[PDB]
Design a protein around this nucleic acid. Sequence first.
DNA 1: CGCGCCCAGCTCCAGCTAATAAACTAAAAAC
DNA 2: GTTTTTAGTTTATTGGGCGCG
Lengths: 501, 531, 7
Amino acid sequence: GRDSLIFLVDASKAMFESQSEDELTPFDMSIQCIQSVYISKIISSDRDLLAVVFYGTEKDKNSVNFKNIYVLQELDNPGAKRILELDQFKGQQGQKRFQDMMGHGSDYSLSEVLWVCANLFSDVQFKMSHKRIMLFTNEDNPHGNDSAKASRARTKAGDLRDTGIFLDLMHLKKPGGFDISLFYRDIISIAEDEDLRVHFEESSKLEDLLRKVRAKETRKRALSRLKLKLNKDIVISVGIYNLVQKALKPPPIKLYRETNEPVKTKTRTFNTSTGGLLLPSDTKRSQIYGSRQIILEKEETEELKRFDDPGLMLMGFKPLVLLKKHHYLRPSLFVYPEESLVIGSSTLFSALLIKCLEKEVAALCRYTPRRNIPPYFVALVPQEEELDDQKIQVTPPGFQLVFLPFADDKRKMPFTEKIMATPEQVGKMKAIVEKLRFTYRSDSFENPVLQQHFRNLEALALDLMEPEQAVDLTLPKVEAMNKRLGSLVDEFKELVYPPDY
Amino acid sequence: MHHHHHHHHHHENLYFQGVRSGNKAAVVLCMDVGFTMSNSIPGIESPFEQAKKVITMFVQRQVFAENKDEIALVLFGTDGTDNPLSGGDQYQNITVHRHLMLPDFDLLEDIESKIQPGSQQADFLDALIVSMDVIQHETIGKKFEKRHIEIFTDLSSRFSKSQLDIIIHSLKKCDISLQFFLPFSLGKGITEQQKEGLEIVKMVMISLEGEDGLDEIYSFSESLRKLCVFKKIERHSIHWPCRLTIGSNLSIRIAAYKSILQERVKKTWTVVDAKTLKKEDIQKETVYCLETEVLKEDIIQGFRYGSDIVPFSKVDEEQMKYKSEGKCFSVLGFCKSSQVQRRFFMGNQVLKVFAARDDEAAAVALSSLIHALDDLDMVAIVRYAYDKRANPQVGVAFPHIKHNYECLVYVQLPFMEDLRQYMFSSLKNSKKYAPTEAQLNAVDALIDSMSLAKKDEKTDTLEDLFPTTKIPNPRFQRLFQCLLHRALHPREPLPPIQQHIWNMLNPPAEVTTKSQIPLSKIKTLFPLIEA
Amino acid sequence: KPRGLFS
DNA sequence: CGCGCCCAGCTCCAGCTAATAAACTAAAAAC
DNA sequence: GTTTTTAGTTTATTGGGCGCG
């Protein structure tokens, strides 16, 4: 099926109160975070269903007419209009639009709120794989004054968890901090091997709230489940995952102008003379070498590609220092144990990981991703787990599957006489390097091409007179850099470039 | 890194010049098929059989290679005489078996069955003159960058030394290089005639190439060791000129080339009719339907924006399209190398960036950057764009440490949209899968036994016992073995993978014996069973 | 540097 | 300024040549 | 079945000087 995510936003008094005047209100932060997920799900052509519910509003909009619960958006595929609708509640002007449209600070009962959300999953005609409720609030004790409500909420929360609906808390900043143990500890869905250590800290920045949401929003999707053979007899099961996948400009789709409906495309193979459809058993494979035609069967062109059975065959252990940074061939993968196939895989995996780390060594393997494919040498680089200040998993624990090039993949460089700079010149450059120093983060740059493409689609889908212009984050901040460098540039030039250049 | 004699022309894109200019070579294989070539010691193969295998290996490699080099075959010591220099009673028992032309399977089949050992003996220097005549009379009109003559002999027979000066003069004037292939390795119970013959061969090589001339004398044995594998894929990277910019006032003229890429054979399978065995008899017709068919004169372009369907023509898309300045290499800033994890490396290439060709000022400027980054343990974060049309990239430019050459290495980094945020359970903090002390010790012993490295002369230098980056891609070797097998034996099924291929894909036999014992302990300590 | 037969 | 148009070097004369990005299809795997 | 991703292709273009709006 299609996965389901319901965004549940608190509309209490505290949600519109900023902790820092320069910082966004927990509500604005929530709206902006939701909009981002909606856009990201569009960028990646995701088939998941999204919903937007508010509680604590004076106005109510839901199927059983439960008071102070407003279903802004029912579960459905994201679009331009739904994103535009969320933009109406963005910023200080938006806060006014929301409060005058629906009201705020009214009394509610989380039990009724959860019923409305659970019902949205039931109304979906298509079958759903995952059912998830994401709660945005800076209130850590909603019914600390009403036992009757607190108890009903726990029972209902319990019922949802038993049904298979996940309840995740996106707790926002509150003066004196947000304490989960006071109430939500018994509401939120907790995985059996976490034991509350895996729970994220309170969000105070949109950036953090966004990553925390994005981290739970998408489920792991293995590229392949393979066997990691230490030998013929000792086989462990592993999952191969793609940590980085090139987000491409979605390909165009063929439509009829009058109907504006997508058109299906069938590609067939037929004999030119007879006109009849060609079976795969009616054609052969040819290659011409040394004035001769060499004919093979389709079955043989596959057989000549067969070496190892699919999986990872352990060759041995090579110290990490022997693996060159400049021997990059194609993006690296991630290896994690698959306990569901071979019982005992995780224990052996953990042992290998612990010892590879201690010895600063990599597990060299002969890799075969699927049947009838020649092998490639890969280095399984030990990777230790890393969590940031917010308790987000920056680096997952496992092995980095690093592809190693064959002699054919390497290219010899043209002859260049070695010319080296003096310490005086290197010194000037060092000073320049130190001036333009910055903190690199893998998520600092957005694809200008992708961003512009969807800004263009937004303008056309909403019939906007002008398309929104994306800010090219890849272009250097020239003016700032020049001022930051000052005379260092002219200094370097005098030491290197002759006036007659 | 190439030799200094290798011209930069081979890397620059010009109209049917440089990379585009067909690098063609003319090769004359001058084989001794004389009586003595068949005489051997009962323990080792005859020089005739050895030389025949070397020639087959050479021709086989050339058939599958992209080079387009032309090959001729001159035989000497044959019973008959077929020469354009024969006249009446000169250059006897020397046969031009094959004239200069592209090698083919008809040649290989001919080598295998038609070439028989001779009963006579010929003058090898006379055979060389006939070989030089082939190059002189057949390179006419054809464009050859190189001309080579490969002589395979045992140097057993008598010969005249009268033509030595005309031989050397013609080889030098016509820029023809020479190579000798003998049954023995150059320094032994060779005959006195062989010692005389060898001295002349040595003199010839020294006259032509100097002290290095001796290096062009090979044994058939060492030649079979180098030619047994198929020719690895070698292509010249196209020279990419541009300017590395730091702000808007500092520009550094640079030249980039592809260091690493997923190399592939260009030629692939052509789907042909099983009866006609022709390509044109097969045609693909892509039809459009809603079930109900649609004509091409009724389809427009569109894109999906979630649930929304947005019609957007290629014309409108062309104008609203993001527009950037092309052929741009710009520094955004510098950061600690630690902040750039190799696990984030993206793209299909690695670029080695050098200073612009013959520009000393640019070379010094770039060397300043390289060493500064290296001495600061930092890297550059740059914006890279191939041309005006190409989608811009954000990547890393890091220093490259070698004494023969200094360069920056470029590798693409990811965009926020490219990253996939998946959470995985902690394994260190696992109560279920934490290994015992005994289990950890078995793995510790396994890693030590299976070491693919060794320290030489206690110089704290690690010698890789299993390099893998020196190994040619087995896919190509396998494809070629099969293509050759089907060409020479059409009725026979495909052959199995050659042992040497498997031998190079496996770690040293030493490693395998050491592995089995700790591997046995691991099998008992770590229970493994399918669910 | 490979030449002739080996290049 | 940026666009399309049209010769480029090598053996009289038309055909050679090849890396490279970008668009494209077929096909395997996961779900 | 379904969708998602990739392996494996094919295809168009290349460089630069000159005249145009």
